[PDB]
Design brief:
The structure is cut from a larger assembly and holds 2 copies of chain A. Chain A has 589 residues and is of the alpha/beta class. Chain A is 35% helix and 23% strand. Bound molecules: magnesium ion and zinc ion (2 copies). The first copy, chain A, binds one DNA strand of 11 nucleotides through strand 16. Chain B: Belongs to the MCM family.
Chain lengths: 589, 197
DNA sequence: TTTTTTTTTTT
């Protein structure tokens, strides 16, 4: 009854934020400057300003939304006439709806209402075009007339062809005219419920969502997203008569969120502590006793180095870690922790993986007999971390796919007439067991781990964990029992804060190596080569590839402390950890 | 509105090249020598010579492109009468269009406009034949009449047959006549975006 | 092509 365009338009112009900045007028600025055509409004902000406007949006969404969109378009038109003839429609998207429903708990009462669902994006289709206003021509020698068939409305989800010519009243043949046909961008994605919500003994459920217009290509597979929109029943084969009055539900997306100022302030305060590096290392797997050297290396892999593109070749910034340890050395516990704290990570197992599942799988579209690719584990981990457990138990045919990923950071696909090269810039963390149960110190690493030497040289660091009973057993027993009793360590950065800290560092920090750091690295290398030249009788090689690892590790240390330069201390720490690896593999100085 | 046919003809014959050599005349003569039927021109040269002509090409390529080809064809046959009876339709192609769109960035607003794409060829089908003007015969014991169904219009990409015989005004069964059907070479290729982008 | 269990030939 009461028009809400008046209260809405002044709400945009008059609204004060946390720091008294008038965000919405600032947000609407680049909407006309950069031609976004889409606006984002928080539900809490609208509710505080006027609850009547807020509750009208949730309930009467299908009616108030077109009215509100028209009001904002007029506001932009008077503010900048240049918007006309450029963008003819503006979308306003609402986020933060309190009505959040689990994927498994959707029932018939929620159809046609604005709801929000949290899940994981698993499938994305290529962008396509959908007709919303067609133009036909009547093929009848008398007629030769053109008209817009879905008059006075929009073309439904089912393409319907006119049966009677509206301009002559006769049936016959109608020809589509693509030149005058109106189109709109259209994409389809599949969302899956998070593993924490799956009940015992059940399999995860999936929901189909539709992204249209500017919402296309707003997310990548494997991302955790929050999606808001309207549920509706799905019609795909109306002509398939005969039983089956049962339909599936699909979601019509109106706004999507992936995964900000106070958090940035909190991150900066943490970096101010001189001992921030020690705090971060102590926060890695707090429930595991000892393994300080391994924890330090795992922290470096989370941040990584800086990739370099030379005149001819490319230098990866990712760090590869290989762990060999006796059974029960808590190898799998840390890898689970790493996969949970990293902003983007994929956890796999040697036995539960295949070559197609790791890189890309060809799927034949039985509906049209068409071939298309599906992203594998390594592709989904691009820009993140790939964790592989029990690498020694993987099949040889499935292991060769990893060889290219670690070396060239690429995956080559040539099958079913599809040829492509895929980026796989991901850090690889692998764990394995020795051949004969426990580890034999006297024998070299190569004959004690059951892996080809061609894959050993591709790892930046290798660590050996030995479970030898000794005087530390009492400390280990006391620590474990305290964990089972609920006792927790203090001064530990929590998972959520740690994940945000890593994401910020990987995005805004690019350390540069100073002259002093270069001299220390060079001097260590050349003196090591001279020492190694006397007697290079070790299973572990000392090739110039080790020099690149020293560069990567030093950059990671600087990035951990949010520093823009690599100083003497960072280079010194990188040498120490590299020196241990060059000697803990069974070879002395 | 303004007939650019004269402007196009003089532009080709009076194009100041790197040394005012009128290289367009040189390639036109080369085209006549080997019967190439395809003339390519640079958008920069057209814009420099007459920016108004360049805008019309890049904006109304659906309408004015056949007009320009007709003007070029008349000039070629006038220059050399032996070109007839060999090529009935010349081709003019534009290169260097400033409107460059990334393949992933294509949206609905770019449909029906002249754009350029950079990528990698992955698949190429063998050369085939496409019908652009068919001939049909009405199989109805009183007709025995032949006609070209797509009257005053090129045959659309969707093969459609007449429903009512135009010559006799009756429905029935129609048979295609391959011997009186116009054909054009047709090939399909797939382009893939570069891994860098 | 792809994962799976099965009998079969042939990688
Ligand atoms: Mg384990
Ligand atoms: Zn009609
Ligand atoms: Zn007839």
């Amino acid at each position: 009854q009461i028009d809400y365009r008046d209260v809405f338009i002044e709400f945009l112009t008059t609204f004060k934020g946390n720091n008294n900045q008038n965000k919405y007028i600032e947000r609407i600025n680049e909407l006309v400057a950069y031609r976004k055509k889409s606006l984002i409004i928080e539900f809490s902000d609208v509710l505080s300003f006027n609850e009547n406007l807020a509750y009208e949006i949730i309930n009467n969404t299908k009616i108030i939304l077109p009215i509100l969109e028209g009001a904002l378009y007029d506001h932009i038109l008077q503010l900048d006439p240049t918007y006309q003839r450029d963008i003819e429609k503006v979308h306003v998207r609402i986020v933060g709806i309190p009505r959040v429903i689990e994927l498994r708990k959707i029932r018939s009462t929620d159809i046609g209402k604005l709801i929000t669902i949290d899940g994981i994006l698993v499938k994305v289709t290529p962008v396509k075009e959908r007709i919303y206003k067609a133009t036909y021509k009547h093929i009848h020698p008398d007629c030769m007339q053109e008209f817009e068939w879905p008059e006075d409305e929009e073309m439904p989800e089912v393409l319907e062809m006119p049966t009677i010519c509206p301009k002559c009243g006769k049936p016959g043949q109608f020809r589509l005219i693509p030149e005058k046909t109106k189109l709109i961008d259209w994409q389809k994605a599949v969302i899956q419920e998070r593993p924490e919500e799956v009940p015992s003994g059940q399999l995860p459920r999936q929901l189909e969502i539709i992204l249209e217009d500017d919402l296309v290509d707003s997310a990548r597979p494997g991302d955790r997203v929050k999606v808001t929109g309207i549920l509706d029943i799905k019609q795909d084969s109306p002509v398939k008569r005969g039983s089956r009055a049962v339909f599936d539900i699909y979601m019509k997306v109106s706004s999507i969120e992936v995964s900000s100022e106070e958090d940035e302030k909190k991150i900066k305060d943490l970096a101010k502590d001189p001992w921030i590096r020690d705090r971060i290392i102590s926060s890695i797997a707090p429930s595991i006793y000892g393994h300080w050297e391994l924890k330090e290396a795992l922290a470096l892999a989370l941040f990584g180095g800086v990739p370099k593109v030379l005149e001819d070749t490319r230098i990866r910034g990712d760090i590869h870690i290989l762990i060999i340890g006796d059974p029960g050395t808590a190898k799998s516990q840390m890898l689970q922790f790493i996969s949970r704290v990293a902003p983007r990570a994929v956890y796999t197992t040697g036995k539960g993986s295949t070559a197609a599942g790791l890189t890309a799988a060809v799927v034949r579209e039985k509906g049209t007999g068409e071939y298309y690719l599906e992203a594998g584990a390594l592709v989904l981990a691009d820009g993140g971390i790939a964790v592989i457990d029990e690498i020694d138990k993987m099949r040889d045919e499935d292991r060769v796919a990893i060889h290219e990923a670690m070396e060239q950071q690429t995956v080559s696909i040539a099958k079913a007439g599809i040829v492509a090269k895929l980026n796989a810039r991901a850090a690889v963390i692998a764990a394995g067991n020795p051949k004969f149960g426990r580890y034999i110190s006297e024998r070299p690493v190569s004959d004690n781990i059951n892996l080809p030497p061609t894959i050993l040289s591709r790892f930046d660091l290798i660590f050996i964990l030995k479970d030898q009973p000794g005087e530390q057993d009492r400390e280990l027993a006391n620590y474990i029992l305290d964990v089972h009793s609920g006792k927790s360590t203090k001064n530990i950065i929590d998972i959520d804060t740690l994940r945000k800290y890593i994401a910020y560092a990987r995005k805004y920090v690019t350390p540069k190596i100073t002259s002093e750091a270069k001299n220390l690295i060079t001097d260590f290398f050349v003196e090591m080569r001279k020492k190694s030249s006397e007697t290079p009788d070790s299973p572990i090689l000392i090739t110039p590839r080790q020099l690149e690892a020293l560069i990567r590790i030093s950059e990671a240390y600087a990035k951990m402390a949010l520093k823009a330069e690599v100083t003497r201390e960072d280079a010194e720490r990188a040498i120490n950890i590299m020196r241990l690896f060059l000697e803990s593999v069974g070879v002395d100085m």
